[PDB]
Design a protein around this ligand. Structure first.
Ligand code: AES
Lengths: 198, 150
């Protein structure tokens, strides 16, 4: 399958999440996503077909993971945006106040600004530190999905947020949103991965 | 292109405002370390802020008396606490939680010169108890109600 940021993938035929970014570990293909999306060895499927398995993950504490894919998968330096896409050009972290957008299978492509860094979230499973907060809206299913700037600089992967009964926080003003993401560089660094760029 | 629509729709950034915003985003990135170096121990954070007229600007806070910066394009804001002070309170909160029903999250927020503790609507008391047990200086922390749940 075509590995693109923001697309839906299932875990163990039980849960859903969104692809973060295409990456490589030497000759090994893969994609980064949220740690809460799957446990080590969990099977990832796209379009019903097995594409890889969770190679490593950390959650809580952090909220990161990467899926090692089969050589048959096609890695692309993109993030879905409607019928088009955003080209991934690098991973330079943007400042607080910078405009950023995220992509996911539920709310699609949504934009806002980075509002805070090094946030500790009190998730039910346990605290996760070091998250970045933005005010673009999101919803259940967008987890693990891409967060990127307008100029194509990959920022991180969706970790969680203050969603409402409807499953998202798009129904409340951006000023009241808490949409959190795990920074990309620490994931790449911990697992020795390289971001696929174009 | 398709990003412009999203930017205008979600951020209220119209095409003609794009260049100036981009210039500010880049400035915030390229000067971040230089600003921190200049403000020294009194550094209190920096961020991109949007003006009422739609333009953007780079702001840098300091707990010192400094009223200007050597680097251009930087608005200096005088605040009470330094980043180091806020960071210490933040660490106390982390420690307190490491040993919290109602508490959503917490983080150093330079723009408001305080550590923010977000709580579910109607859980301010939980936020109060959390801050107290953490031993964090209440003057450096501010509780903010947050809709929905994490
Ligand atoms: S995922 O990271 O997008 C995300 C979205 C919504 C939830 C439910 C929060 N109560 C969790 C994670």
């Amino acid at each position: 399958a075509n590995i693109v940021g923001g697309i839906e993938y299932s875990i163990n035929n039980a849960s859903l999440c969104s692809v973060g970014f295409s990456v490589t570990r030497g000759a090994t293909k893969g994609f980064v996503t949220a740690g809460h999306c799957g446990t080590v060895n969990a099977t990832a499927r796209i379009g019903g077909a097995v594409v890889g398995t969770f190679a490593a993950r950390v959650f809580p504490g952090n909220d990161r993971a990467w899926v090692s894919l089969t050589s048959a998968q096609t890695l692309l330096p993109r993030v879905a945006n409607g019928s088009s896409f955003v080209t991934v050009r690098g991973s330079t972290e943007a400042a607080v106040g910078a405009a950023v957008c995220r992509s996911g299978r539920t709310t699609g492509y949504q934009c806002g600004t980075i509002t805070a860094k090094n946030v500790t979230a009190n998730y039910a499973e346990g605290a996760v530190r070091g998250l970045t907060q933005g005010n673009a809206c999101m919803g259940r299913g967008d987890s693990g999905g891409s967060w990127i700037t307008s100029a194509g600089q990959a920022q991180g992967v969706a970790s969680g947020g203050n969603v409402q009964s409807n499953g998202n926080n798009c129904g409340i003003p951006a000023s009241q949103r808490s949409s959190l993401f795990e920074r990309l560089q620490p994931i790449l660094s911990q697992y020795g991965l390289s971001l696929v760029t174009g | 292109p398709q990003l412009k629509f999203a930017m205008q729709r979600d951020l209220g950034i119209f095409p003609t405002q794009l260049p100036q915003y981009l210039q500010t985003e880049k400035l915030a990135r390229t000067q971040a370390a230089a600003i921190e170096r200049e403000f020294g121990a009194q550094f209190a954070g920096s961020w991109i802020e949007r003006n009422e007229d739609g333009s953007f600007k780079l702001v840098a806070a300091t707990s010192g008396a400094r009223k200007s910066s050597t680097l251009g394009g930087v608005e200096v804001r005088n605040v009470r606490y330094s980043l180091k002070q806020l960071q210490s309170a933040m660490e106390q909160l982390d420690a307190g939680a490491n040993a919290l029903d109602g508490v959503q999250s917490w983080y150093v927020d330079p723009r408001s010169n305080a550590v923010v503790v977000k709580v579910d609507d109607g859980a301010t008391d939980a936020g109060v108890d959390f801050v107290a047990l953490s031993g964090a200086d209440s003057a450096q922390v501010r509780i903010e109600s947050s809709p929905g749940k994490l």
